[PDB]
Point group: C2
Chain length 316, copies 2
């Protein structure tokens, strides 16, 4: 029933969260050099507008943080991961997020918290970028063009933003292409690999800790209402050094939707949702912080406001 | 029946007409300074990629060519303008453009060529930009948000590109707002004022001369497949010094569609088109060079690939 803007908490009148000119008053960045721009973009003490300005200039220059054939990876040692939500903690999540429309069944599918054995793996520090996805398209001849590319056209000023929306099978295809190109075991992360990389062995509610922080991720509460250059919300980095797990774009995993086994809570929608879509995790610039919860499971519907991107894992 | 990409002459596979990073190899522009960037962006001898790079950097910095409350204007003296198409020249237009789908009735509504007395007037050198339109939205509280702004959000990296698509009445509203702000007689140009400003007293077929030139304007034949910073196709400037009249975005005029009087050619669609839409002129980054003809009359249908912007005139 809601318009896109209503769903994003915005009025019908115009709202801006960025300057009219991103580098106005930040002209010292022109002489900084790319290594200095990278430090500024990833420094949590720098105001967002200056990090955004640095990231935007890197987007024009060619961002050296994005190396398509040797992407920045973080190693994660084998572990007994705890995945999902304790049924006794559902009430707290609902009180926390009912204001934005969350209802009990959406959170109940995170139950029960359970153990998953993970072998050692690596995960991309950043989500896959527009520039990376373009190289994939040009090498493969794929017709899997991103929905946000107007008329299928590459948005060059946003070279270092995450790509969206693509299908889960296009994300799969990107991973197979890079695996073949590099000889490395690239793939999408499993749902358990994604959640553990965000939450750690401490099972944090968010990548950054126990309480939502609108400055730690690009979400709709206070984000700029578009994607951002990867990695310019450093306060939201996970314990393993992964950036943008909360916010920016939702991220596909390898798993199609399934109920977690052992959950005595009746899900009357399972008769149509089981195996019906690929799980997406992490939330996005258009949605609220409930989606930046490490345990939140999403992906059921295709909508303009659901920005679907991805990041790769690697078998070690 | 055609997809957007089919209508643009593009395959299903990916096509790029820009570098992956607009300023890669153009890093000398970082130290140029805005006046030098402006000279580069508007120099027809500079390769398009370097002009685009300069314009993109100006878009980040704040483009000094765009002065919202004192927009760059060109004065045009009172004249007896010749508007439209001689019926004897219709066959030549059809042979020239039938390959892109143009058929006789679309061109026949330009007939007959006729005389319009114009008093002295001024016309904006550039189409109205994203940055200018944002200032309008923030001052008025208007809900007339541009269609290309995803979820209604300002695209800050494209601050100095033309705004699109807006309704003709939103263009009217912008003109009234600026008139009230500045005390100057701003308005949209009449259809005759627009065509004369493009074609001159010589009644050139295109602003730049008699033959189509894919490098003189941002059209779909060879343009970058998005809007461009205003004024970076200087080879297409009109005899009066107006930029981007061919290409970039279509431009509304003050006139609703009417047949030119005196045209003995039967238009069976007049029974539904008369007064039914606002005329748009000049063509765009998504369409072919037939629309960059000074006499071509457009605007009948609302479609994603029809990018509708505007520029202001001023009574002198
Ligand atoms: Ca994310
Ligand atoms: Ca134009």
């Amino acid at each position: 029933r809601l318009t896109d803007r209503e769903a994003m908490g915005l009025p019908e009148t115009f709202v801006a969260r960025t300057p009219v000119a991103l580098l106005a008053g930040h002209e010292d960045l022109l002489g900084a050099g790319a290594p200095c721009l990278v430090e500024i973009a990833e420094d949590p003490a720098q105001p967002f507008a200056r990090r955004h300005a640095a990231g935007a200039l890197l987007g024009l220059l060619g961002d050296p943080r994005i190396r398509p054939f040797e992407p920045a990876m973080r190693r994660i040692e084998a572990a007994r991961a705890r995945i999902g939500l304790d049924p006794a903690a559902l009430g707290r999540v609902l009180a926390e997020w009912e204001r934005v429309g969350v209802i009990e069944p959406w959170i109940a599918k995170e139950c029960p918290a359970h153990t998953v054995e993970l072998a050692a793996y690596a995960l991309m520090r950043y989500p896959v970028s527009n520039l990376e996805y373009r190289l994939f398209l040009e090498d493969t001849g794929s017709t899997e063009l991103p929905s946000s590319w107007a008329f299928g056209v590459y948005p060059a000023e946003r070279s270092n933003h995450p790509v969206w929306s693509v299908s889960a099978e296009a994300a799969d295809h990107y991973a197979r292409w890079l695996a073949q190109k590099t000889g490395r075991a690239f793939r999408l992360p499993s749902e358990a690999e994604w959640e553990y990389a965000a939450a750690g062995g401490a099972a944090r509610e968010y990548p950054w800790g126990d309480a939502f922080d609108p400055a730690a991720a690009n979400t709709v509460e206070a984000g700029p209402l578009s994607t951002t250059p990867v990695g310019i919300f450093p306060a939201g980095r996970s314990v393993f050094g992964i950036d943008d797990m909360g916010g920016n774009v939702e991220e596909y995993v390898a798993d199609d939707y399934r109920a977690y086994p052992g959950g005595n809570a009746i899900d009357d929608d399972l008769a149509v949702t089981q195996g019906a879509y690929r799980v997406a995790r992490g939330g996005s610039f258009t949605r609220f912080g409930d989606l930046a919860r490490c345990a939140r499971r999403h992906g059921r519907y295709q909508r303009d406001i659901y920005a679907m991107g991805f990041r790769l894992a690697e078998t070690l």
